[PDB]
Every structure is written in C-alpha cells, then in structure tokens.
Amino acid sequence: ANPCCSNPCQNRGECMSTGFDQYKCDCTRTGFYGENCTTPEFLTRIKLLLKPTPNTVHYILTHFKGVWNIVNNIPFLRSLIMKYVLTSRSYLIDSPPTYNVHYGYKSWEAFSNLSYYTRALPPVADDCPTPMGVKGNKELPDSKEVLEKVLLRREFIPDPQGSNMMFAFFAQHFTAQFFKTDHKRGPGFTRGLGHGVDLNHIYGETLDRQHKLRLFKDGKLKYQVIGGEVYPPTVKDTQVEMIYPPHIPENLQFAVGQEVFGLVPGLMMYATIWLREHQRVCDILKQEHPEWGDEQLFQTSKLILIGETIKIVIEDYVQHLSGYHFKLKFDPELLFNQQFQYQNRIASEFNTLYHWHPLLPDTFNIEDQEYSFKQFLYNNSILLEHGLTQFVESFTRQIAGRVAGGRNVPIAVQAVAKASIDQSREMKYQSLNEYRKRFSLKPYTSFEELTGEKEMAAELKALYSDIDVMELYPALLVEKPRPDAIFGETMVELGAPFSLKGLMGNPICSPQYWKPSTFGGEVGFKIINTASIQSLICNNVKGCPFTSFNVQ
Amino acid sequence: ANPCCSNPCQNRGECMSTGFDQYKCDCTRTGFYGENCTTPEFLTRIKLLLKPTPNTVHYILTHFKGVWNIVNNIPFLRSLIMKYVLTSRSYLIDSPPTYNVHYGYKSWEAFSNLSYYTRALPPVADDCPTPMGVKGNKELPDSKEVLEKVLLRREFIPDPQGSNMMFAFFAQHFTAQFFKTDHKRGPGFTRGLGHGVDLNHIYGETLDRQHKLRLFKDGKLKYQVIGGEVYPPTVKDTQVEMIYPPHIPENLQFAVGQEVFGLVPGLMMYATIWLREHQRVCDILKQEHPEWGDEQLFQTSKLILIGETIKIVIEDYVQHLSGYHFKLKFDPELLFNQQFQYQNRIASEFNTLYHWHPLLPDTFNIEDQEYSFKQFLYNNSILLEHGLTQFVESFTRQIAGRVAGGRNVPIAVQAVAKASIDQSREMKYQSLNEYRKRFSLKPYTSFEELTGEKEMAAELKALYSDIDVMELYPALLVEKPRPDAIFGETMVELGAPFSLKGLMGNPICSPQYWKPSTFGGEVGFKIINTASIQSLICNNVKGCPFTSFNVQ
Amino acid sequence: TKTATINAS
Ligand SMILES: *[C@@H]1O[C@H](CO)[C@@H](O[C@@H]2O[C@H](CO)[C@@H](O[C@H]3O[C@H](CO[C@H]4O[C@H](CO)[C@@H](O)[C@H](O)[C@@H]4O)[C@@H](O)[C@H](O)[C@@H]3O)[C@H](O)[C@H]2NC(C)=O)[C@H](O)[C@H]1NC(C)=O
Ligand SMILES: *[C@@H]1O[C@H](CO)[C@@H](O[C@@H]2O[C@H](CO)[C@@H](O[C@H]3O[C@H](CO[C@H]4O[C@H](CO)[C@@H](O)[C@H](O)[C@@H]4O)[C@@H](O)[C@H](O)[C@@H]3O)[C@H](O)[C@H]2NC(C)=O)[C@H](O)[C@H]1NC(C)=O
Ligand SMILES: *[C@@H]1O[C@H](CO)[C@@H](O[C@@H]2O[C@H](CO)[C@@H](O)[C@H](O)[C@H]2NC(C)=O)[C@H](O)[C@H]1NC(C)=O
Ligand SMILES: *[C@@H]1O[C@H](CO)[C@@H](O[C@@H]2O[C@H](CO)[C@@H](O)[C@H](O)[C@H]2NC(C)=O)[C@H](O)[C@H]1NC(C)=O
Ligand SMILES: CCCCC/C=C\C/C=C\C/C=C\C/C=C\CCCC(=O)O
Ligand SMILES: CCCCC/C=C\C/C=C\C/C=C\C/C=C\CCCC(=O)O
Numbered sequence A, B: 001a002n003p004c005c006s007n008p009c010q011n012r013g014e015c016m017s018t019g020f021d022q023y024k025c026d027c028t029r030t031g032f033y034g035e036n037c038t039t040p041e042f043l044t045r046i047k048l049l050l051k052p053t054p055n056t057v058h059y060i061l062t063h064f065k066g067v068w069n070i071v072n073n074i075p076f077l078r079s080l081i082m083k084y085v086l087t088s089r090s091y092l093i094d095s096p097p098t099y100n101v102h103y104g105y106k107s108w109e110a111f112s113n114l115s116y117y118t119r120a121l122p123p124v125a126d127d128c129p130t131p132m133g134v135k136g137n138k139e140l141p142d143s144k145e146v147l148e149k150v151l152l153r154r155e156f157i158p159d160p161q162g163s164n165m166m167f168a169f170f171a172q173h174f175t176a177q178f179f180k181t182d183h184k185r186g187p188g189f190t191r192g193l194g195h196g197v198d199l200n201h202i203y204g205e206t207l208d209r210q211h212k213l214r215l216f217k218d219g220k221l222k223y224q225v226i227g228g229e230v231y232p233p234t235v236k237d238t239q240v241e242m243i244y245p246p247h248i249p250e251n252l253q254f255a256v257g258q259e260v261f262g263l264v265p266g267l268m269m270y271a272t273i274w275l276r277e278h279q280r281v282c283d284i285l286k287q288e289h290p291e292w293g294d295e296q297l298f299q300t301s302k303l304i305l306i307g308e309t310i311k312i313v314i315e316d317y318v319q320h321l322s323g324y325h326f327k328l329k330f331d332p333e334l335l336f337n338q339q340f341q342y343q344n345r346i347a348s349e350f351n352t353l354y355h356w357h358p359l360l361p362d363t364f365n366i367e368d369q370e371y372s373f374k375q376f377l378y379n380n381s382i383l384l385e386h387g388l389t390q391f392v393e394s395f396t397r398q399i400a401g402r403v404a405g406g407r408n409v410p411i412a413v414q415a416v417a418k419a420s421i422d423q424s425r426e427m428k429y430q431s432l433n434e435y436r437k438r439f440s441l442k443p444y445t446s447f448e449e450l451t452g453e454k455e456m457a458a459e460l461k462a463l464y465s466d467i468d469v470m471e472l473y474p475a476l477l478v479e480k481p482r483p484d485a486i487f488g489e490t491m492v493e494l495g496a497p498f499s500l501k502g503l504m505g506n507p508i509c510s511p512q513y514w515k516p517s518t519f520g521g522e523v524g525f526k527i528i529n530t531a532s533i534q535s536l537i538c539n540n541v542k543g544c545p546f547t548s549f550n551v552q
Numbered sequence C: 001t002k003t004a005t006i007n008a009s
C-alpha cells in the first residue's frame, strides 16, 4: 500500500509518502527534476552524452595492449589513469551510510548501529503487494527451481581467465574478515564491526581474543613448530574459541583470528602464511627499532600487514579479476586532492554478489590426491600431510570454475546457493534491474539479453515472466560473461565501488596515516609498497614456490 | 629516555626513535623539512607571510559593525564569509583520528577503539625524565597551590560578554551527550561511543534505554503531566536503570536520556524542554504524514532535533560566545565543494578546555529565592516549585562568571578544578606551549605575556619557573581575555576546530542526508533551518518567555 | 522573533 512500492523515483531521487496514496520524489542533487526526477538538467544532458558505457571502457582497458605497455611504464601516465578509474567509481556509494534491512528511510538507528550491513538500495516495504514492490506475482519463483534449472553445475565450466585455487581461497580468506554474518540476528547483520580490512581474521575481533593469540615478546603472535615448520598455536594452548567438530584431535585445533578457518585446509593455509608474515615483519622492525617494545612492534606490524593486504588485493587480486592490460595501482596519494570519505560500512549487497561459489572445483587436487568436499572439510591433517609448499604448488595449478555463465554451482554446495536466494528475499532486496539502475547500468529488457543465450533465458522467462522481476543474485551467476571473462557487467559494476571504499577508505590510506613514520619508517613502508602475492608466499613458504592468481 | 621526549619535531612533523638515543622527524606534508621540520618550503614561506594572526582576524570580526551589517544582509556574502571561517579551521584536526592516552604513535587499537577520547597531541612517553618531557622538574607544582593562588574565586567576576544561566546550563546539558567520561576506566575514556551530537542525552545511549523512554505511539517519548505541565516520566514507570537517592519522591525521579541530569534542576529544565520539543515535532510530522507509523515518526523527529541542536549551537550559542558582528551560519552546503570528513572522534583536550566552571555563580537566583550550590543540586522540587517559565525568566536574567581572566572558579566546585589539573597530568598532557604550536599559535615567552598582568603571572612563575612547562588547563582559566571577552586566544583557537568537526561532521550534514526527504519533507526541514534558542523555549515553555544566551 | 511576538500576546 506504501505509495513508494513501485520505486517511482528515478536517478537516485528519493521517494517519500505524502499521504496514504501519494508520494513525492526528492530530486535534490540528482541532476534531474520532475515528479520522478526524470527530466535532466542541461549539464546532465551534456555529461550523459559524454559518458562512455562500462562495456566500452572495459573494451578499451582490455585491448591496445601495446599502448597500455607504454602507459604502464610512464609513472605519471599510469598514476593519471589509476586516478580516473578511482574517481570514476567514487560518486556511487553512500558514505556516510544510509539504509539497512530494517530502515527504508534514513534514521539515526540505521546510521549508528554498526551491527547491520548497510544497504545500497532500501528494502522493499513490508506492505507492498508483490515481493519486488508491485511487479510480478504475490510470490517469487521457487528457489529450488531456479537453483536447479539455471544455477547448478552439470559439467565443470573452467574460468576462461585462469583463476586458480590460490585465488579462490584468498577470496574466501580475505573477505572472511568483513563478511561475518551474525546468524543469531539475521542475514542483514554482521559481527565485523570494523566494516573493512582490519585483519581481524588474523588478530581477532576483540582485544580479548587478540591477547590470547599474542606472544607478548617482540610483538609477535604465538605459534607452534611442528616438524620444523611454524604453525598456529592450538585451542588448548591459547583457549581461543574455534569452530571444530567433536572428533578433531586437540593437536589439530589451531587457534587463529577467525574461528571458522579450521573448516577448510585451504583457509588454514593462508592463516599460517599471514601469521608467519606478521612475525617476519616483527623481526624486521625489531632490527630497525631495538628500542621498541612488544606493543609497538605488534601494532606497527599489524598496520603494515593491513597495507600489504590492500596492496595485494589491488595490484594482484583485482588486477587479475579485471583482465585489464593496464596495471592497477595502490596509491593513496591519488585521492589526496579528491573529495573522498575515509570511512566505510559493508553493504549487504556486496556480501550477496560475493557468493562466488561456482569458483569451487568438484574435487581438490593436492599433489597426487583428489579430495572430495567431504574429506577436505575440517581436515587440517591434509595441510600438515602435504605441507604449505605442496599446497601452494597444487593450488597454483588447479583452475577454478567460471562464476558468470550459468549452471556452474557445485551441487555439493547447493544449499549455500539456495540460501543466497532465500536470504536475499528475506532482506527484501529490490529487483536486478533496480540495482542496475542504481549503478548507472541500463536495465535488461529480456532474459535473453541478460544471459546472452536462449535455453536458460527461456527457463528464466518461464519462472519469472517479467525481466523486471528478475533477482540480482541468480542473475549474477547466469549473466552473459564478458569476452572470455569470469564475470558479466553487473558483477563488476556493483562490486568495484564497494571494493574501492573498503580498500581506499581504510584509515591508513588517509593523509595523516599515509607516511613512513606510521609504519616504523622507510623500511616498514617499503614492505607495504613492494608487497605481492608472490612475495608473501616466497617469504613465508619453504622453497619460495612460484605462485599467482592465474593458472600459468 | 625516549629520544622523542623533547618533542623535537616542529610544524606537525612526527618524531620516531631510530635507536635508543636517536630520533627522526617525518616532515611529510608538513610544508617544511630539515631534521626538525623547521626549514620552510618556498610556498610555505609565501603562505606564512599572508596568514593574519587569530587576533587580527578576531579584531576585524569584532569591529566595522557597519560593514558587517551590509554583509549580514547579503546572503551571497554572508555564505562566502561563513565558508572562510569554516575552511580556515579545517586543516587543524586529525580525522581519521590518531593518538589517545595509551598510544603516542598511530596504531589500529588507537584507531578502532571507540572507548577512548582521541588526542590532539600524543601523551608524554612514560619514560621521559620530566612530566612535560625533559623540561621542568621531576614534578609539576602542587595543584592545590596553583588552584588557590590563581584559580579560586575571591570576588565574583562577571562575564563581560553577558553570558547568563541559560547559556551556562545549555553548555552543560549540550556537552553532556559527548563528554561522558568512563570513570571506572579512566579520564581518557568515554561512554559516548557516538562521539558527537547524537542527542543520546535525550534518547539514551542504548536501544534498551531508548525503548524504555518511548511511548510507542505517534513516535513520542513517554511523559507525565503534573499540574497540567509535561515532564519526563518516572523511573517506576519506565524502569530505566537510574537510581536516585532513596528519599526522592517517586514522581520526582525523572527518567531521561542522560542518567546524570536528574539531579540538577537546571539540567532537568532543558531535559523537559527538549522532551517537549520532540513530541511537538512528532505532532507536526504526524499531521504531514498521517500514513506514517511510530518508528518513522520517532526516528524522523530525532533527526530533526539533532539538526535543531546544531542550528542553535552555531547561530545562537557559538554566535554569542564569539562576539562577532558577523552572523555565523549553519549551512552544510558550504562544505559540499570542500574536502571535509563527515566523521568525528571527541578529543580529550576538547573535554579539558571545556571545564568552564568559572561560569557558575555563587548562588542561583530563581524568582525571589536564592539558592546555594547545596540546595540547588539533587533538588528537582525547585523546578516543579517555580516552573519552567520562572526558571527561564530567572536564568535569562542571571549573569555568568568570566572564564578567562583568572581566579574565578567558585570554591564550591574547587575539587572539580583540581581534578582537571590532576587528571590532565595523569593522561600525560603536553605543555601549554606545545598545544599552542599544535594549533598554529605563537608560544608564550613569559607568564606575564600569558596573563597580561603581574600578580598572577609572578605567582605562576614562582610555581612553574619556565613558561614552557606551564599547563594547558590552568593557563586557559588565567589567560589574558580578549577585549571585554569571556575567553583568551588559546581557548577559542583550540575549541573552534573541535567544535566544527563535532557539528559539521555529523552525518545529517553530508550531501546524502542534507535534503528535505530526510526530515519528512519541507516542513520538517524548515524546523531545522529556522531553529533558535528563543523558538525552542517559546514553543515549549508556557507563556513563551523571552530568552537569549546573554543578559539583555 | 515572529513566534515570540504572536505567542506572547
Ligand atoms: C542494533 O540493532 C539491533 C536490531 O534491532 C539491536 O538488537 C536488537 O536489540 C533489541 C533491544 O536490545 C533486542 O530486544 C530486546 O528487548 C526485549 C524486550 O524488552 C524487555 O525485556 C526487559 C528485560 O530486562 C524488561 O525489563 C522489559 O520490561 C521488556 O520486557 C528483550 O526480551 C530481548 O531480550 C532484548 O533485550 C533484540 O532481540 C535485538 N536482536 C538482536 C539480538 O538481533 C541491537 O541492540 C542494536 N545495537 C546497538 C548497539 O544498539
Ligand atoms: C578498548 O581499550 C580498552 C583499554 O585497553 C579495553 O579495555 C581493557 O580490556 C582488557 C582486555 O579485555 C581488560 O583486561 C582484561 O584481561 C584481564 C586478563 O586476561 C585473563 O582473564 C581471563 C578470564 O576469562 C583468563 O581466561 C585468562 O587466562 C587471563 O587471565 C582480565 O583480568 C580483565 O578482567 C579483562 O577481561 C582491561 O581491564 C580493560 N580495561 C578497561 C575495563 O578499562 C577495551 O576492551 C577495548 N575495547 C574494545 C572494544 O576492544
Ligand atoms: C511518474 O511516475 C509515476 C509512477 O510510476 C507515473 O504514474 C503512472 O502513470 C501511468 C500513466 O498515467 C499509469 O498507468 C500508472 O497507473 C501510474 N501509477 C503508477 C504507480 O505507475 C507517472 O506517470 C510519472 N509522471 C511523469 C510526469 O512522468
Ligand atoms: C633539531 O632539534 C634538536 C632537539 O631539540 C636540536 O638538538 C639540540 O641542539 C642543541 C645545540 O646543539 C643542544 O644544546 C641540545 O642538547 C640538543 N638536543 C636537544 C634534545 O635539545 C638540534 O640542534 C636541531 N637541529 C637543527 C638542524 O635545528
Ligand atoms: C582500489 C581498486 C578498486 C577497483 C576498481 C578497478 C577495477 C574493478 C575490476 C574488477 C573487479 C571485479 C569484480 C568486483 C567484485 C568484487 C570486488 C573484489 C575486490 C575486493 O574484495 O575488494
Ligand atoms: C560551525 C562552527 C564554526 C566555529 C568557528 C567560528 C567561531 C569560533 C568562535 C567562538 C567559540 C568559542 C570557543 C571555542 C570552544 C568551544 C566550542 C563551543 C561550541 C561547541 O560546544 O561546539
């Protein structure tokens, strides 16, 4: 009944009810006007005519490799370009944050309560006739039906971009610090009150946990040495709570920042690598500052790893994902003369779009074995059995599945894919097209346009009837990928802005923090600025195995 | 022993130890260079030569009343000017925040832990020889001595600017929402995790509290009606944890957002006024939105009062304090084209400088009665006895004491003044001169220069010996005021930047929030934009008594 | 001002 159920206001104008059956759009700063903020102002008309589409830009960035080569080698140019890509995203995210699962309108509760994931688009009011507002039927199509018909994997579809298991597990380990859904409260709530890259998955969310994981000597983290190799301490030794099935021996219950990392040996591998890297940095700083104590050694090391993490995520992780010939760059200075807010609140939608399960292979090949999902889950003995070196060489070789494309979600993890659907509905998410508009993308006019084919499109049409009622999550996994890419337009355009805010919005990226002294000097600062996924492994994995996020 | 104990690095350059007995200054972005960041860069020099001193600017702003008149009436000009005053402060506060009582160097703990007040200047390292670093004696002069010799009041010194009791109590009530020291933890800790104007002193810090204070009808706050007058509800009815001395009559045990106002009749008066104003706004919004429910009515009203509060604090409160002929203006738009961070963390120093106790009179005169501190604290009956109207008329008439000047702290509150001294020392505050430099002010070269006289200066010289060891808090209460002003240079220059961040840094001041729809439309938006201390009282105090922050 | 004037009347 809410007069705003149809999402009448366009171009980001805000809808407000003005009576039981009337609404008004607040077109403030939208660059448009009119009942629905649809009439463009002059300069808007101009700007629109001069803005190239995301696909045109993506094309340019993935071609002319030759010129990109000269550019990549002209610091001034490279910086210039990176600045464009940075600021081009900027105007997209609301920061300070606005809505959440419970507030379809700004409120001090929505703003102040850090326990909620924020929302890029407000929820669909509970009193709306249909789930998407007023379009579609009283009910959305059965999620099991959507799942099976177009999401489930028949034959493994490898990622054309070459993503491997090093990448798949890094994605999982990395995002685990900020996507920590508070199940006891609901899908729209989080336990990561830091709302970003704070590395709590290494150090713990609370001072209490952190203290239990620290050695309190040289600023280091506790650790055990098994077979001459450095591993995390155990739950018995530290008493930090971890999530482990009853039959897991004590000697195999490792204590790490994130209590869920024992669920996969692939996660415990990164946990061990970063724990190692912390100590490494501690040793380096101790050498430079024989006068420092444990606290400063610890704190400064944490600041450096935060920086290393951001560096790697942009120059290695995102670089890979992008497929650009242009070398992405981590340089906080690029934003210093720009209007930018050094703060971030993790969006529910960022969490949703990030359910990249089709990445998972059907089996995990380490050295000579192939492990099923079952014998891999909760088995840290496989890691101790093969060792980090073998794990790295193996994960570097194994290719990951394509995400966009359709039907590539491993059946072994189908309940997770169904939950994404079900939960998005719970949190009353708006349609795929509403989110596309929300991010300056052209809405799809047909399911065939979305998938770029006929079979799945037809099955979708059968289930949804109207493209304007199509859901975001399923759409992301079925969307026509880009030329030999892992993702389609919607995934890149919604995720990029969320990522930039989570990466560049970190305090260490701000002017007062971005200086050598913050990281113990030029030495510590260099660790950040020369960090790469290869160095991280090289420095912390016996033998320094070659590695990357793509399968050679 | 810390090589940085002498605060060697100037112009905001950062000091870092490079060995047991060596340091290095990080002059990044300081505009200077050299071992101590004292050699200016050409442009720096240029700039320095063109920046007028705070006193020159203060002079201009307090003279030429005639031209200020034309300006005050040329919207474009007025905006233009207000923009200058706004941006002129800007570059002063670290935001994202940096240090705190426990961290003299940036750390993730200092950044993330919202339980700490942030620090404008890092603490003096625990291993330094003297309290101020390396200057002065192993000990600072007895605080009782300083207190008595130059802080205690002999004869009431009235504020030349005319501040009254309406102003004194508004200062207390207002700042009580963000200066909520966590005594069980220490002076450098706070319970106001909102770190700003969130109006938790009306609505409560927590949801549980807020809920106990709400009526859950029309978005209103619970209240009782005594003798036809609306007052906050009781503890028995709301069950809001709050425990009054056992003898307080049941109906006199008011339940309000801040559990400490219940004592003071003057604080309870503002509590009653704002409670009344909330309901008022609720009624107004209900009229505009007969279709809205309790939650939105409540939430939207809270957003409006936050705006009203900021409006009044800038255009009425600060306006008064300033003494400017120029009409200060609350306009978030003025910052939209500026680089500004919409976030704030309350500084320990802002709390310290705000200990404006000399404002308190020796007795409180309400109507014909004159009350001592003893019978005017913990006694709510006085308020019910006289009523809000009489309280307003009386508080508007009674003048407040001058703050700067020296010897004007009521003996009745001397322990509070001693604590400020003692606690500042506890939190290892740096000297007055270090803070003056920190805020681009010229350090004082003599105690006579500081006080602008000889008697107190001489007593101070006797106690401290060196001006460079003089403490910030005492200095603020003894500083030579400005021409017929309540404060001296240091107070205005340190407080202004902290205030602007706390006021303009509020989310509702950001572009995404600063629009009519956020406050329920043009009507609600107007409430914010036409708000004044006279309207607040007029609309909520029977009879609409005249009022202002100055004694006619 | 305006409010004070009419309300005080
Ligand atoms: C961020 O938003 C979250 C979602 O709203 C907040 O969590 C939710 O918080 C509420 C309030 O704390 C909680 O419900 C509570 O109220 C119930 C009823 O109140 C009564 O119980 C007391 C008991 O002493 C009694 O004296 C009164 O007469 C009255 O009966 C309680 O039954 C319930 O246990 C709880 O205290 C929601 O369950 C909660 N849900 C979460 C668990 O998902 C969250 O608090 C907020 N964060 C912040 C920092 O504000
Ligand atoms: C912001 O900073 C504040 C100042 O550092 C933090 O408060 C301080 O937090 C620490 C840690 O929680 C607290 O000390 C704690 O540790 C003591 C010892 O650890 C032990 O006790 C456990 C009990 O289960 C035992 O299993 C272990 O073997 C070991 O003996 C405890 O005795 C103490 O009770 C406490 O838990 C400080 O007292 C604390 N002080 C505050 C109260 O002023 C604050 O936590 C932080 N905020 C955030 C959000 O991180
Ligand atoms: C602004 O948007 C509203 C809501 O979408 C439009 O209203 C619809 O108008 C058509 C044609 O009159 C009707 O068939 C619909 O029933 C109307 N209501 C809804 C909820 O769709 C309106 O036409 C638009 N106004 C302008 C000036 O473009
Ligand atoms: C930079 O600052 C340091 C520290 O204040 C200066 O060192 C002092 O120099 C004088 C003269 O040599 C000595 O009397 C002091 O004992 C030195 N140490 C301290 C702690 O004061 C240094 O001279 C400055 N350097 C420059 C280039 O100006
Ligand atoms: C600072 C760089 C910001 C990125 C802007 C440039 C290019 C975007 C290109 C590709 C990224 C692909 C998909 C987006 C989805 C999730 C974000 C992943 C990174 C993170 O989890 O954060
Ligand atoms: C938008 C505000 C701009 C302020 C800059 C302009 C003028 C400053 C002049 C006088 C203020 C006097 C003292 C400063 C100390 C504390 C702040 C009080 C207001 C508050 O508790 O915040």
Ligand SMILES: CCCCCCCCO[C@@H]1O[C@H](CO)[C@@H](O)[C@H](O)[C@H]1O
Binding pocket: A053, A055, A056, A059, A060, A483
């Ligand atoms: C001078 C630089 C000119 C760049 C022109 C780029 C045109 C890219 O055009 C793009 O081609 C893609 C096919 O790969 C399509 O899928 C996209 O929809 C289309 O916009």
Ligand SMILES: CCCCCCCCO[C@@H]1O[C@H](CO)[C@@H](O)[C@H](O)[C@H]1O
Binding pocket: A148, A152, A153, A154, A411
């Ligand atoms: C080899 C993979 C074939 C995938 C096609 C699945 C078509 C829908 O088949 C479904 O498969 C699920 C997973 O096995 C089962 O749990 C369901 O009961 C079944 O109906």
Ligand SMILES: CCCCCCCCO[C@@H]1O[C@H](CO)[C@@H](O)[C@H](O)[C@H]1O
Binding pocket: A168, A169, A171, A172, A175, A176, A179, A180, A181, A351, A354, A355, A356, A357, A358, A359, A360, A420, A423
């Ligand atoms: C192939 C590996 C893909 C990892 C991407 C994980 C993206 C989201 O991550 C998951 O989101 C869920 C919310 O529904 C949370 O409950 C989970 O704890 C969280 O890990």
Ligand SMILES: CCCCCCCCO[C@@H]1O[C@H](CO)[C@@H](O)[C@H](O)[C@H]1O
Binding pocket: B053, B055, B056, B057, B059, B060, B483
């Ligand atoms: C039109 C521009 C006139 C500029 C002249 C500014 C003079 C301000 O001069 C100020 O006068 C004060 C006395 O009131 C002194 O205390 C200050 O130190 C001094 O700088």
Ligand SMILES: CCCCCCCCO[C@@H]1O[C@H](CO)[C@@H](O)[C@H](O)[C@H]1O
Binding pocket: B168, B169, B171, B172, B175, B176, B179, B180, B181, B351, B354, B355, B356, B357, B358, B359, B360
């Ligand atoms: C005349 C009224 C003057 C009001 C100014 C109060 C300034 C400081 O405010 C006080 O600071 C204390 C910490 O030292 C806190 O414990 C108190 O709760 C807080 O109100």
Ligand SMILES: *[C@@H]1O[C@H](CO)[C@@H](O)[C@H](O)[C@H]1NC(C)=O
Binding pocket: A374, A375, A376, A379, A381, A382, A385
């Ligand atoms: C656990 O890992 C070991 C070592 O690789 C493997 O042999 C075994 O099958 C696994 N155990 C279970 C219950 O899956």
Ligand SMILES: *[C@@H]1O[C@H](CO)[C@@H](O)[C@H](O)[C@H]1NC(C)=O
Binding pocket: B374, B375, B379, B381, B382, B385
């Ligand atoms: C409390 O207030 C009343 C009313 O003004 C006054 O007469 C009385 O003396 C006060 N009581 C105490 C115990 O101070």
